[PDB]
Design a binder for this molecule. Structure first.
Ligand SMILES: *[C@@H]1O[C@H](CO)[C@@H](O)[C@H](O)[C@H]1NC(C)=O
Lengths: 49, 42
């Protein structure tokens, strides 16, 4: 069956490329939301707010 | 018959990037063609 499928070939390269783009896009989305600041300000110990 | 023999253990050698043949008889240029066939492994 793999040999029969092999004559298509470009279809699955296309599909895997699309899904890879989607995955990269998700990691993008998380980065752009949460990684706004690249300085990890630790909370103060004393809560005199 | 020949009897002046001196047997030795079978000697081995690494074959690399060898055993590739044109898989068809079609002219094809500037193409990254892929094939599946009986090929000599690298
Ligand atoms: C010697 O020669 C004969 C016929 O040519 C053959 O049958 C036989 O197998 C041979 N023996 C060896 C050790 O070569």
């Amino acid at each position: 069956c793999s040999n029969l499928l092999l004559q298509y070939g470009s279809f699955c390269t296309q599909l895997n490329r699309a899904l890879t783009g989607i995955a990269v896009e998700q990691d993008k989305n998380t980065q752009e939301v949460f990684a706004q600041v690249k300085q990890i300000y630790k909370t103060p110990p004393i809560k005199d707010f | 018959n020949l009897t002046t023999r001196t047997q030795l253990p079978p000697a081995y050698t690494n074959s690399f990037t060898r055993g590739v043949y044109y898989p068809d008889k079609v002219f094809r240029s500037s193409v990254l063609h892929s094939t599946q066939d009986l090929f000599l492994p690298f």
